[PDB]
């Protein structure tokens, strides 16, 4: 179920994910990408699923972070949907989408779709 | 698009969207899923990229609901990635990710991918 | 849906898609992409699962194109997944991904998704 | 580049993957799948683009399987995506989207998505 959610990750990429889970459902925090027009922390908000299910299930929640900060503003955002696993080995699966701004000319090639997976590690 | 995103706004599956766009770049607000195993409102929270560009781009942002509230709890959530085209028919148009829990053995069957797009009711 | 899918068939990019379906669940043809870096046509193969149900159901099917002909070559691929539902309109609803061959460091970019809505044309 | 794709690969999953690349751009085999409403092997026909880019990247290409055999029929298709990398260690790394023929009233939760990753080992 829900629990050590809150805590700093870090996935493949060496993108930090430091969150705080509130106890009625909310995800809060600050994302650092190691890759991307992107540079510095990001706000990030999000909602996990405070009452998972009791056959050893994960957690599901995402979140979203809109590219823009006081350094840099790449018009996209990113959402992460997946679950949290904890024990020995906490782990947030996820697969994610990036949409960037354009024109309706280019709509057709506007979100990236990609997968992470985080760790305390 | 602060005052433009914020509204009601309705999908072509007859879901509610009801959000509010702070001028930090947070979008806050309810969502009523017209299908699923959902009942009643549930809290959505998101962010969108305040400061687009000039031009006729849109305007990226993406929000999150997990499905539970007092009446239901689907053990699931769902986050939309879109972009807001605004003008006399503004739409936000997205794709979405709903991930349920499940064990790890069922893990590759836990995302369903989707498209929905919305539209802005008036006021 | 063998007699059903064979035909003519163009997506609101205005893209055109030339298909076969054999008896065996094959699927053949030529695609022409009205966007991207693609020009004139490119070969296709998929499958398409011959015995669906009775009912109301889409028959589901998929297939790929890998952008290189003898004018270009644009290093990458898409794939097509959905439903072919037939009737006096008959339709392709489907959802792609097109990922582009990239070093590994580049390789979180290499794919975009989205959907297509194919529409036959008579004959 | 292309060259070394033909051949068993095995996924995550435990699924097994036999391929064969011909030269101009087919790819042809058999798909049997540790999971799912699946059992033995199945026809599958894809595409992999015979000219690769000459800054080391990898090969683009994808595959379908509809899920219909002589055992089983579970009115489905899956599509991978990807790009393999040969060398030491080769790999296909892909997305793939799992549709099943549902009513209209059902399409909206018609499609799954997931990666999975193989190797010859
Ligand atoms: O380039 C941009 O548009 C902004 C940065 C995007 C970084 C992406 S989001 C998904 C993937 N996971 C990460 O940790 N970073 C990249
Ligand atoms: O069934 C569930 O797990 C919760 C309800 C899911 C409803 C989905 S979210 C994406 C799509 N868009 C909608 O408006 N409703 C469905
Ligand atoms: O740019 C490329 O790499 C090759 C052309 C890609 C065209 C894409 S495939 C999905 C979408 N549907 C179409 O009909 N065209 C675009
Ligand atoms: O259950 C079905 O509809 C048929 C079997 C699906 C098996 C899937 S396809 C994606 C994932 N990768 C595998 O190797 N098997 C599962
Ligand atoms: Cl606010
Ligand atoms: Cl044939």
């Given at each position: 179920a829900?629990?050590?959610?809150?805590?700093?990750?870090?996935?493949?990429?060496?993108?930090?994910?430091?969150?705080?889970?509130?106890?009625?459902?909310?995800?809060?925090?600050?994302?650092?990408?190691?890759?991307?027009?992107?540079?510095?922390?990001?706000?990030?908000?999000g909602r996990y699923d405070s009452a998972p299910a009791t056959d050893g299930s994960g957690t599901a929640l995402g979140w979203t972070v809109a590219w823009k900060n006081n350094y840099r503003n790449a018009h996209s955002?990113?959402?992460?949907?997946?679950?949290?696993?904890?024990?020995?080995?906490?782990r947030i699966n996820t697969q994610w989408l990036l949409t960037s701004g354009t024109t309706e000319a280019n709509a057709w090639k506007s979100t990236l779709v990609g997968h992470d997976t985080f760790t305390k590690v």
């Open positions: 829900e629990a050590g959610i809150t805590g700093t990750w870090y996935n493949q990429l060496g993108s930090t994910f430091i969150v705080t889970a509130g106890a009625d459902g909310a995800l809060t925090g600050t994302y650092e990408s190691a890759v991307g027009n992107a540079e510095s922390r990001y706000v990030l908000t955002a990113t959402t992460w949907s997946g679950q949290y696993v904890g024990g020995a080995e906490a």
